């Protein structure tokens, strides 16, 4: 299971680090990603560690946001900078793990509210 | 009916295309082909699957046109 | 209505996929994308176009699942 | 323009070479291929020279048929061997030439009838 934290109220302009910790080991993750959904809007991927360790960012957060992980702590992070009101929404973390060859299980957190 | 087949991407892009499809629902499970240019995605609902199906023929990552059809791999 | 977009194949397989689609009608012309995984094929007739469209979601060359849709690229 | 020849009647087990000649230069072809259609049957590609000069063959003709070309003569060939009644149909040659970048013109011959008893 995945439990996100670090959300809340920041002012426009500020920085904020989201956390997601796994109950089991997530060190062999195929992918790790953060998604956000603002009220009455479609969910969008904001940041992804792709398989092999390359990254993808939404165009709107390029250069402002970083996705990282601590293997030792079993945690995924989203570093957010220069926060804008448009960054407002429920953020959730996504971890994919290969069980048997070619079969991948998906793990989702409950989400954490960010309000700029 | 929660299951779809996403296809038409190179092996190098598979994980990029999965994060794009993960937008439309909390994917439970996905199964990747050995050779093929396709994967089978299990969403939570018909409604999520339907949002994935509506993306059939759309371009992702500037240069990857993507097919999406109802999953017919019984086996899966 | 004579034009279709065939998609979902790697660049190295383009000419293998064109010969597969040449089966369904005497193609007048085809236009290949710079980066994209797609091509626009002009057939002689709607009926030929319709036969290529029926191949949407089928597997060619054991491992290439192929998308086919009505061509919407107006310049072409 | 492409005009095929060398078709006709052959006995089961025999060999046969089809020819197709172009009126303009086809030496820069993107691809060259032979197709066949038997009466009330779907046309199928028999043999193709893919871009870069690799070949594709229908499973039914692998090891029995060869597609080749003579640049000097502006001709494409289909060498057929161990002919079976199932190889019966109209054969046509297909040449694709890039005009401007990413744009390809397609040339088809009239066909040539091959009949195996």
Numbering used by the authors:
A (entry chain A): 3 to 118
B (entry chain F), C (entry chain E): 173 to 248
D (entry chain C): 3 to 119
What does the study report here?
With a molecular mass of around 120 MDa and an outer diameter of ~120 nm in higher eukaryotes, NPCs are among the cells’ largest protein complexes.
This revealed that the nanobody docks in two copies to a highly conserved epitope of the homodimeric RRM domain of Nup35, contacting identical residues in the human and frog Nup.
